[PDB]
Amino acid sequence: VRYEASLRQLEQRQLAKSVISRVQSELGNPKFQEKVLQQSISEIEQLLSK
Amino acid sequence: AKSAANKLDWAKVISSLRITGSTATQLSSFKKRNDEARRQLLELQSQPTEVDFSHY
Amino acid sequence: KAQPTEVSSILEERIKGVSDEANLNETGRVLAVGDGIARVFGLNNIQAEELVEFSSGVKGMALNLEPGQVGIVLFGSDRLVKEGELVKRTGNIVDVPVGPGLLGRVVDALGNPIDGKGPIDAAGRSRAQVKAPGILPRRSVHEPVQTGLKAVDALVPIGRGQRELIIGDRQTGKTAVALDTILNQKRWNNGSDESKKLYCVYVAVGQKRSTVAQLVQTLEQHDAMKYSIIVAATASEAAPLQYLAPFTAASIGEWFRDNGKHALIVYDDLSKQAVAYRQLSLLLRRPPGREAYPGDVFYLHSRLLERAAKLSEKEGSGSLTALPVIETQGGDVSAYIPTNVISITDGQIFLEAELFYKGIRPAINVGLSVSRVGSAAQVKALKQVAGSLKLFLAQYREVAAFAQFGSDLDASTKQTLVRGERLTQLLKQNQYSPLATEEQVPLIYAGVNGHLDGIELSRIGEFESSFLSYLKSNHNELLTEIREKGELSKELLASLKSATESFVAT
Amino acid sequence: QDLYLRELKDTKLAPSTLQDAEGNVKPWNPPQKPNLPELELQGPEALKAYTEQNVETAHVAKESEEGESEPIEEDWLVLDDAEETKESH
Amino acid sequence: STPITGKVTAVIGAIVDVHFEQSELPAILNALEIKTPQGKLVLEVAQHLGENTVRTIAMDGTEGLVRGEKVLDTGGPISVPVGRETLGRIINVIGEPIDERGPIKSKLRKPIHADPPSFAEQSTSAEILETGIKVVDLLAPYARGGKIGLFGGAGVGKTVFIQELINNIAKAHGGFSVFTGVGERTREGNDLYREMKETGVINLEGESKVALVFGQMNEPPGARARVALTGLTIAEYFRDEEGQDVLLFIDNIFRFTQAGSEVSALLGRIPSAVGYQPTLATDMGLLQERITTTKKGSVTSVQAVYVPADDLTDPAPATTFAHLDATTVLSRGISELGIYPAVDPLDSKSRLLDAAVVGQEHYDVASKVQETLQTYKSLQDIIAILGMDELSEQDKLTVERARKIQRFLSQPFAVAEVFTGIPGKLVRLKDTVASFKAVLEGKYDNIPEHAFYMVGGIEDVVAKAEKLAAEAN
Ligand SMILES: Nc1ncnc2c1ncn2[C@@H]1O[C@H](COP(=O)(O)OP(=O)(O)OP(=O)(O)O)[C@@H](O)[C@H]1O
């Protein structure tokens, strides 16, 4: 049981450095451009709602 | 029902007052004290001697 | 595998759902961060002691409000909170997760678990600054907290709802009393009745990381972690965490108090909480008092320890019992801090350094350690067979400095001197072996009535385990009688005297 | 929210060739299958004792015996030494 | 590239106020440079006064600063070169070597205000670090990744003791040493460097086994309040990267507490009780809790203590003593009997002299040793008064055994081979426990007292017994 919990911790830290890899994957995109549209429509959704 | 054995042993203790210089008789009661005090902690110490297949 | 990523993606939906309703009637710029505290412009609708969140994850409590700006204390190192960032306000007075799901976990002061066993199954949030229960839903204490130590339940008994102080010195065996009490509650935490179970919340403030690590390892060796709650505020982390963490743990205790169950809490040690409080009040220009603890440091330990008593039947007969620990300086009982914890708690267990220097562990000084509402809530059996024992140790303490002259004396002082030395050597105890009251009664009973007087002084330590195994093998029914009845009648007393004089005879 | 959507799609799919299809790993230069299920699978029997503790040794106890069926040449000695004790008694 | 350039607006002693232009501000504890004709002048941002204006403490001399000079930013905290190239190189708190052996070609540059390790990684059973000196590993064993208070003034072989620790950790566990003199006297700084060359722990041509960080006394107090952190980061890179058990030596932690006092009294914070800074517990914890044991490796710290005015309720020893796992006293009355080392046995007590950690046999042997030397000390007056005729056979054997033990505590040093010429004996623990156990039994009472002085183990005890038997006949 102890070793199972240790293997789960190793899986989580591998996916943590994979999250770092996903940050590196995301930050090169023109989602930097395309996502301003997402904020635009989202502010339309928020501020109209009151 | 061990108290009858031990009661008669202390009866023989207050009767072995009459023979001073007991070599190993009280040491024989010491050996029965040894393993009888060992067996009760042995039976209380254990788990149900099985792998809990439901939870564990 | 990806199962925590599934759970975290559900939490992403919550974060994205929260982003669809995020309009923070609050945000203000951080004017200046200095002295480990931040000044914030804006936030024109904030509350006193409202939790806020800076733009780097460090939370904060807004403890003062001024016309113009609001002063927010930090909850960590100020390395993260930068000038000119963004201050959303959360919306809450400072709360922590309470409920039964924390049993087994190790959290710090804000309910963030740091064991590595997933999120807290939290049955609710509760304020840190709860008003103490007033004088009407209180009952005077009438139930024992069997600590399992010999000398504690002999001399200074603890009631459910009786705030008792463990005061002592550095490396003199202070933590071991609370740890042995938590390990003694295994007698009932394995059991079935709720009103005899006793949950332990150990609140380490100001201590090292590795000490709390070893203490969690100890409470998982002897299996206490099905009922333990560790609130750790280790000395690496910054000062308002240590100012907060015993209060949040007192909220954890009040959750068990209002819901009928009984629970023990251990503060360890509040002489570092007052260190953290004098740090937070000497960085806000508030002027110091006697020995530079700020003038309200009585009020701090007041509003902490007063959230622990015995609720009566009107609220559900729950309870909360506190053991704060105070590190003095060289056997002192008259600095400004240990004369404020004493003037709150219902008594002291003064663990004097000189007796531990002679190895008598635990080193309770009997003539100083006293309890005020302990006597009305002891187990009935010990109160029957130790009503002489406090007065007898007072008698032996009277002739302590009188026998140092080496002068030949009468017979009565020699009799009391031999019986007093046998009782002093008798109350020793190894680590992690609490003795239940069903076994504390016969050992003290052999001590009181002169049966030990033929034994040499060195054999007493093995006399303890020998007489215990003699009663475990043969007179098991007497131990069950003391367990069930909790009281020695005349027949029980005569049978116990026979069972003593039997094993005393050899 | 396409922010959340594209983030979670890359979050799901970028290790999905490490979990769903076992085309072991593209960014990690050491191989992944000889780390946990090949080396570290015998890990707990490389971390605990092998072939006695994990195989658990269902072992036969040593059958301890009686006084080897010899009354005479020692019961007479016990009887005469008991005479000597009762002399000293 | 994109510099964050501002102007120095105020120089107050060791306090420096730096204005930055808007929307650019680095947070607290970030390194700032000022270029001088003499070199570079480092600042560490400690307080934000608002107004896009920060307030720093100096790290070198602040003479001659025209207000209005450009202030260059480096974003992160004070960077230090780490790793293999740092060995044998005297690095100050800035990160530059001062031994004039050229620049250090290190591979990374690390911050020093890092996080301490999280609670899930703290090692949950403190084992015993086999140091190598006998009396250490017998009586007051050093906690593996724990903290050790080494008392006593200079001139009792303290530097000899600490070089002996260097050699024995180099042999037994293979770990490296990081020495750090916070507030170190400059002259004895150079004398320590020369002696660490000549004892072989610094090889200027081969592979030295130590990194020196000497924060000198003539630096402003902001330096000395980070020199220990520099030595700590050089320890942490050897711990969590290459996976070893590294010895971090700090002398002298009271001067670090003085550095804390004067930094947080120059900043205008109100002083506490006795006069130490009110951030005492936290700014001791940020040095203590980064010295611990993770599942990768460990850093064990030997740090001295200057007890102020011979008093132990003063909060600086009363705060250090809430962290120290084991003390070690180098007294006067033990080197006065010509004993190397001078580890006094009755005083150096450990929190890890306990049977649940060191085992039952070790604890039994050490307890009988402590009671033996205790009875010896309690007899030493009436030994001179009454003589050896008032001793019964219960007592005269204890006097003989305790003289045997007291001579037996001394050890030939791995560094006193140019002092005394006797080559050093690295004694293992499993030799040490058995040797003291056999002397506590009485199996070598016929052996004379003179054959127990400066001996490694029980085998060299037997060898010296035979050699002095041969020289006597
Ligand atoms: N009954 C006992 N048996 C064995 N050792 C004991 C016992 N009681 C105390 N000790 C010893 O006391 C030492 C310190 O225990 P404890 O932590 O209670 O002291 P303390 O003053 O609370 O230390 P701190 O204040 O740093 O927590 C431990 O090393 C432990 O070995």
XYZ file of N, CA and C and ligand atoms in Angstrom, chain C residues 149 166 168-180 202 207-208 211 215 268-269 272 325 327 351 356 359-363 428-433, chain E residues 321-324 350-355 363, ligand 1:
178
model
N -1.012 8.340 32.189
C 0.135 8.453 33.056
C -0.260 8.086 34.477
N 0.217 22.536 30.883
C 1.461 21.792 31.001
C 2.586 22.794 30.867
N 6.561 24.083 31.726
C 7.834 23.428 31.927
C 8.953 24.228 31.301
N 10.057 23.548 31.058
C 11.224 24.197 30.496
C 11.637 23.494 29.219
N 12.714 23.992 28.632
C 13.175 23.518 27.337
C 13.841 22.151 27.444
N 13.407 21.218 26.586
C 13.897 19.832 26.533
C 13.777 19.151 27.887
N 12.662 19.396 28.568
C 12.424 18.811 29.879
C 11.225 17.881 29.886
N 10.808 17.413 28.723
C 9.736 16.452 28.682
C 8.374 17.084 28.712
N 8.168 18.149 27.945
C 6.855 18.777 27.956
C 5.909 18.104 26.978
N 6.385 17.808 25.771
C 5.501 17.324 24.717
C 5.049 15.897 24.994
N 5.853 15.152 25.755
C 5.606 13.733 25.967
C 4.341 13.473 26.768
N 3.929 14.412 27.617
C 2.700 14.221 28.378
C 1.491 14.272 27.457
N 1.451 15.269 26.577
C 0.346 15.383 25.635
C 0.348 14.233 24.640
N 1.535 13.798 24.229
C 1.615 12.691 23.290
C 1.168 11.378 23.932
N 1.515 11.164 25.202
C 1.046 9.974 25.893
C -0.448 10.027 26.155
N -3.892 18.003 17.770
C -2.592 18.473 18.202
C -2.162 19.610 17.292
N 7.242 25.036 15.883
C 8.194 23.947 15.966
C 8.807 23.670 14.604
N 9.802 22.790 14.595
C 10.481 22.450 13.357
C 9.571 21.602 12.472
N 10.266 17.828 13.375
C 9.636 17.382 14.612
C 8.185 17.000 14.376
N 6.425 13.370 14.639
C 5.262 13.186 15.487
C 4.101 12.583 14.713
N 0.579 23.556 21.490
C 1.974 23.255 21.779
C 2.824 24.018 20.769
N 3.395 25.141 21.184
C 3.332 25.664 22.533
C 3.045 27.158 22.496
N 5.389 30.222 21.961
C 5.758 30.709 20.646
C 4.621 31.424 19.943
N 0.769 24.523 26.285
C 2.115 24.219 26.740
C 2.890 25.522 26.750
N 6.610 27.260 27.413
C 8.044 27.134 27.605
C 8.512 28.325 28.419
N 6.440 20.826 35.092
C 7.456 19.822 34.791
C 8.836 20.406 35.027
N 13.813 15.886 36.063
C 14.194 15.164 34.855
C 15.703 15.012 34.756
N 16.414 11.965 35.998
C 15.870 10.885 35.207
C 14.451 10.471 35.526
N 13.804 11.085 36.511
C 12.464 10.672 36.908
C 11.489 11.198 35.870
N 11.237 10.417 34.847
C 10.412 10.934 33.787
C 9.056 10.252 33.800
N 7.942 10.996 33.710
C 7.795 12.445 33.627
C 8.050 13.120 34.960
N 8.559 14.341 34.902
C 9.070 15.016 36.084
C 8.041 16.004 36.623
N 7.491 6.591 38.027
C 8.179 6.706 36.759
C 7.414 5.954 35.690
N 7.708 6.282 34.440
C 6.984 5.664 33.346
C 7.786 5.816 32.070
N 7.861 4.743 31.298
C 8.565 4.806 30.037
C 7.714 5.530 29.006
N 8.312 5.804 27.856
C 7.587 6.500 26.810
C 6.639 5.524 26.133
N 5.484 6.043 25.726
C 4.473 5.346 24.929
C 3.860 4.153 25.656
N 3.854 4.151 26.980
C 3.146 3.121 27.741
C 2.217 3.773 28.751
N 18.476 27.201 20.877
C 18.287 25.957 21.611
C 16.885 25.389 21.492
N 15.985 26.054 20.795
C 14.744 25.418 20.405
C 14.872 24.730 19.064
N 16.076 24.673 18.507
C 16.299 24.026 17.231
C 17.403 22.985 17.249
N 18.340 23.059 18.187
C 19.518 22.204 18.155
C 19.210 20.790 18.622
N 22.523 14.721 23.794
C 21.747 14.718 22.569
C 20.293 14.434 22.864
N 19.426 14.969 22.015
C 18.047 14.514 21.987
C 17.894 13.196 21.253
N 18.929 12.721 20.567
C 18.869 11.417 19.927
C 19.767 10.397 20.604
N 20.025 10.570 21.892
C 20.583 9.483 22.686
C 19.391 8.756 23.292
N 18.718 7.982 22.452
C 17.521 7.290 22.889
C 17.439 5.921 22.240
N 17.003 4.939 23.030
C 17.009 3.547 22.608
C 16.043 3.260 21.470
N 22.266 2.469 23.521
C 21.756 3.292 24.607
C 22.202 2.767 25.960
N 8.788 8.673 29.607
C 9.854 8.931 28.828
N 10.622 7.939 28.357
C 11.687 8.186 27.583
N 12.083 9.413 27.225
C 11.404 10.497 27.634
C 10.228 10.308 28.479
N 9.744 11.522 28.743
C 10.543 12.412 28.114
N 11.530 11.804 27.448
C 12.578 12.487 26.666
O 12.376 13.895 26.670
C 12.902 14.435 25.462
C 12.108 15.636 25.002
O 10.738 15.314 25.060
P 9.734 16.537 24.891
O 9.676 16.914 23.438
O 8.478 16.264 25.669
O 10.541 17.691 25.635
P 10.090 19.174 25.274
O 10.619 20.102 26.325
O 8.612 19.130 25.002
O 10.884 19.461 23.916
P 10.241 20.556 22.950
O 9.850 21.638 23.914
O 11.370 20.911 22.025
O 9.081 19.859 22.296
C 12.787 13.336 24.442
O 14.068 13.148 23.855
C 12.452 12.094 25.218
O 13.435 11.107 24.928
